[PDB]
Amino acid sequence: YYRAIKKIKEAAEASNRAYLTSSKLADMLGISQQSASRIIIDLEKNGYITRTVTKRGQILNITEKGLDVLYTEFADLSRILAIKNNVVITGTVTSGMGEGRYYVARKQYIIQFQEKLGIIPYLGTLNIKVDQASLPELRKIRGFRGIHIEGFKTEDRTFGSVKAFPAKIQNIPCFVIMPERTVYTDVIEIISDKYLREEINLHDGDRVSVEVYTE
Amino acid sequence: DQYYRAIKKIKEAAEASNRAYLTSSKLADMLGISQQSASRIIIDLEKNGYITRTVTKRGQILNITEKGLDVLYTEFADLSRILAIKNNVVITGTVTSGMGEGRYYVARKQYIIQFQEKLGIIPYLGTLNIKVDQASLPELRKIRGFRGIHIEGFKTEDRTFGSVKAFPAKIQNIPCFVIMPERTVYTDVIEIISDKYLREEINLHDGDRVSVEVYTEGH
DNA sequence: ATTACTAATTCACGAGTAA
DNA sequence: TTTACTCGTGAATTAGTAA
Ligand SMILES: Nc1ccn([C@@H]2O[C@H](COP(=O)(O)OP(=O)(O)OP(=O)(O)O)[C@@H](O)[C@H]2O)c(=O)n1
Numbered sequence: 238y239y240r241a242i243k244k245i246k247e248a249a250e251a252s253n254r255a256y257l258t259s260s261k262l263a264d265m266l267g268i269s270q271q272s273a274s275r276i277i278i279d280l281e282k283n284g285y286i287t288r289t290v291t292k293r294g295q296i297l298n299i300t301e302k303g304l305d306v307l308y309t310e311f312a313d314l315s316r317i318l319a320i321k322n323n324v325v326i327t328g329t330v331t332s333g334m335g336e337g338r339y340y341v342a343r344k345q346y347i348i349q350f351q352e353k354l355g356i357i358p359y360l361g362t363l364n365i366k367v368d369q370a371s372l373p374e375l376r377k378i379r380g381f382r383g384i385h386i387e388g389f390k391t392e393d394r395t396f397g398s399v400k401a402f403p404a405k406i407q408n409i410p411c412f413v414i415m416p417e418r419t420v421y422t423d424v425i426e427i428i429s430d431k432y433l434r435e436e437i438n439l440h441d442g443d444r445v446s447v448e449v450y451t452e
Numbered sequence: 453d454q455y456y457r458a459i460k461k462i463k464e465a466a467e468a469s470n471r472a473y474l475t476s477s478k479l480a481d482m483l484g485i486s487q488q489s490a491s492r493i494i495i496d497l498e499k500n501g502y503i504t505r506t507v508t509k510r511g512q513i514l515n516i517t518e519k520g521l522d523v524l525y526t527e528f529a530d531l532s533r534i535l536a537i538k539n540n541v542v543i544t545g546t547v548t549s550g551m552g553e554g555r556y557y558v559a560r561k562q563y564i565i566q567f568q569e570k571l572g573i574i575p576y577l578g579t580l581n582i583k584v585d586q587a588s589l590p591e592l593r594k595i596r597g598f599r600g601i602h603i604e605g606f607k608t609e610d611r612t613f614g615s616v617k618a619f620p621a622k623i624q625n626i627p628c629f630v631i632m633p634e635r636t637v638y639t640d641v642i643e644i645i646s647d648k649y650l651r652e653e654i655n656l657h658d659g660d661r662v663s664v665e666v667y668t669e670g671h
Numbered sequence: 672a673t674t675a676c677t678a679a680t681t682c683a684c685g686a687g688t689a690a
Numbered sequence: 691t692t693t694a695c696t697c698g699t700g701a702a703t704t705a706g707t708a709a
């Protein structure tokens with residue numbers, strides 16, 4: 238489905254919507270009209286686009302899952318060709334229930350954070366709600382593999398594999414952690430051996446910049 | 453796209469070396485296909501110039517060619533363009549002298565008119581040759597995947613002159629352009645044009661190492 | 672115009688196997 | 691073990707249409 242999503246995004250230009258016909262997509266791809274029509278139907282069925290289709294053609298909306306196909310390909314090639322592509326994300330500090338402390342305190346995560354990232358972290362995650370204008374940079378980071386943290390099973394629940402990226406928030410070293418199975422939210426989570434709210438005097442609502450190292 | 457996927461996987465296995473020791477069934481496992489299909493893909497990649505091989509009863513040594521890498525860098529450049537990810541380039545290399553033929557090519561009226569309209573310059577008649585350092589060859593390949601500024605080719609009673617792509621560039625803070633044929637030629641020599649005579653503008657001697665910044669978007 | 676169904680066709684895939 | 695051939699099968703694609 239990669240080539241068709243690539244061409245729909247190219248047609249969508251700046252935005253993530255394109256007004257197209259199956260014939261236009263077909264000739265963009267070097268395939269028959271009938272195949273392009275089928276490809277559009279399958280992309281919608283599998284959640285890569287949403288669409289409105291009439292006898293006047295189609296409005297195709299690339300979803301976050303559709304875009305992730307392209308950003309994942311870009312990250313694959315960046316990694317395989319050793320092309321540097323670090324990222325800056327800006328967002329705002331938020332608070333929650335204490336979910337991050339529950340996760341980070343798991344013994345099976347802690348051992349891996351030390352073995353793979355070299356830290357014993359503060360038990361928690363600093364949540365950052367990414368600004369709308371930084372969403373393309375969030376999509377780019379989510380494309381990359383980062384440092385693999387193996388998931389595990391306990392008696393109460395199952396914990397998925399996560400990926401870690403070396404990062405800096407106001408020049409404080411830290412790591413962005415996200416599930417390897419991507420879920421499209423605007424919230425990123427940061428761990429560090431420093432308690433970041435104290436280290437850099439953060440409050441809910443403060444805007445911060447996070448540099449993320451994808452290599 | 454199946455060739456793209458196979459080239460990508462072979463490069464993934466090869467990493468920086470551009471060489472991967474593989475059996476066809478090992479590549480098949482990597483691609484999720486049959487041993488036979490992978491052996492057929494390997495032969496077709498060879499037939500089409502994407503790899504060269506040493507083949508024995510033990511396995512294969514698969515060498516990705518410049519053309520094979522161009523497939524991957526062209527796909528990278530496509531995504532960089534479509535996703536609007538800024539991916540300019542810094543090249544290092546050494547100044548060389550040639551046979552003095554760049555002067556002839558740049559002086560073709562049909563190019564000159566396009567250099568003036570599209571690049572805003574009447575070039576000095578010649579090209580500054582830079583032999584790119586071995587360490588900068590991956591970045592040279594990155595540049596070649598991008599489209600640059602299209603310069604249309606043309607026909608005379610003599611010969612055909614091929615289309616050219618130009619990239620805005622800077623050499624030691626001097627604005628210039630890198631120009632290369634659109635029908636990609638896998639050479640380690642890049643060619644710079646400018647309205648300035650660069651030998652005098654920045655006292656360039658043969659063998660001098662220089663850094664060239666090449667803009668693959670905008671500019 | 673279109674979309675997109677069904678049927679024809681083709682050509683890609685992998686089984687079997689020789690060397 | 692390999693590489694890599696032939697060839698039967700069917701999944702993928704296109705053509706012919708209907709709406
Ligand atoms: N390296 C870290 C990790 C966490 N925190 C902060 O420490 C607290 C505890 O983290 P957590 O348990 O994750 O709390 P919340 O983020 O509020 O909860 P949630 O994950 O539910 O959003 C939070 O105030 C969080 O911002 C921090 O300052 N530095």
Ligand SMILES: Nc1ccn([C@@H]2O[C@H](COP(=O)(O)OP(=O)(O)OP(=O)(O)O)[C@@H](O)[C@H]2O)c(=O)n1
Nearest residue numbers: 549550551552553554555578579580646650651
């Ligand atoms: N903007 C430019 C263009 C070219 N040159 C120099 O102008 C001379 C003539 O260029 P050219 O005819 O292209 O000669 P070579 O580069 O030596 O020959 P060739 O292109 O065949 O390799 C060369 O010394 C070249 O380095 C320069 O300094 N400034």
Ligand code: NA
Nearest residue numbers: 337362363364
């Ligand atoms: Na948290």
Ligand code: NA
Nearest residue numbers: 554579580581
């Ligand atoms: Na020259």
